[PDB]
Swiss-Prot record:
It comes from the Eukaryota. The chain crosses the membrane at residues 6-26. The chain holds residues 1734 to 1757 of 2555 of the full protein. This is Notch 1 extracellular truncation. The gene is NOTCH1.
Amino acid sequence: KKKLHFMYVLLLLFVLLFFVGCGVLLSKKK
C-alpha cells in the first residue's frame, strides 16, 4: 500500500514547481 503513497508524495514536488512556474509568467507584467 505504501508503494502507492510513495508515488504520489513525489508528485507534490512537481506541484510546487508547477504553480510557481506560471506565477512568474503573470507576475512578469500583471
